[PDB]
Design a protein around this ligand. Sequence first.
Ligand SMILES: Nc1ncnc2c1ncn2[C@@H]1O[C@H](CSCC[C@H](N)C(=O)O)[C@@H](O)[C@H]1O
Ligand SMILES: CCCCCCCCCC[N+](C)(C)CCCCCCCCCC
Length: 291
Amino acid sequence: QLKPPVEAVRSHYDKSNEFFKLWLDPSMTYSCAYFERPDMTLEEAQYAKRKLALDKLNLEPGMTLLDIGCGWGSTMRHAVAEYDVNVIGLTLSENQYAHDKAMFDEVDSPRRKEVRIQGWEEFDEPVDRIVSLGAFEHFADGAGDAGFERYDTFFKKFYNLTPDDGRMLLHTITIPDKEEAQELGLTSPMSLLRFIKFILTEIFPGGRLPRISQVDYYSSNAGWKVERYHRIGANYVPTLNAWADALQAHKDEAIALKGQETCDIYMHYLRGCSDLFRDKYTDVCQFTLVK
Ligand SMILES: Nc1ncnc2c1ncn2[C@@H]1O[C@H](CSCC[C@H](N)C(=O)O)[C@@H](O)[C@H]1O
Ligand SMILES: CCCCCCCCCC[N+](C)(C)CCCCCCCCCC
């Protein structure tokens, strides 16, 4: 069986909740926002992004929703409150677990609000609908068993854990297909290579970005059909800019918590990544997978 990338994932996400709070929106949503309307704030765009994803699962009350890689819980909390479903959240982060365990305790509701420190590789329960936002980029990584081949186990596992009317909303960052890349005229300056190196070393160790053709191959191989490809990477520019700005704003506060270095590293990372999505080097897509 497969082994979850615990140390690699925790090296980032367990940096400090207080820290992440300083620059993330109030719901601490940590994935590409969605500005469905020009005048939304980051916080409203995040809600819009969550809604966009959830409305595609055609959720009815009573169903059990599975959030693979639930971060700081926003999607779970939103799912219950707006669709009245039961939710199980998976994460490898200890601080996110701690944070969500407490966040759920605040408001009481009939439905189930479960958060676990369990990898998708170990999940084995029947669920109605699945949602994963910004966690997929870690799925080709593992504690010793890294490799894209992992996607195959992924789409099969969850194809078998869902009903005939099963649906999965896969939200992930993506890189251009061999062709679509040359048409964009994407170059790789020495500075770009240095940045990627910086990201894979200090920010997201083990991260791997899929091409759309990869998601198609492995998901279809399990029997899934993409009912809709919704590319929205351009939205990541406002998002990453909002995050970097918010961090600049509370710079003194942040330098207090984590020091000077950590803050320089993060600003560099937030700023650098924005241009990647603006320049079309990377994109974001929400695959609506159905049977
Ligand atoms: N193998 C694995 N199994 C389960 N969760 C994983 C994982 N690798 C990474 N993750 C989780 O995926 C998340 C990436 S951050 C995304 C958080 C959330 N979906 C949001 O949109 O705010 C983290 O919570 C991390 O713990
Ligand atoms: C090229 C190496 C890429 C490693 C990517 C690891 C991605 C982890 C994504 C995690 N979330 C969803 C929390 C988002 C973080 C902000 C966007 C970062 C985009 C980086 C693009 C690098 C090319």
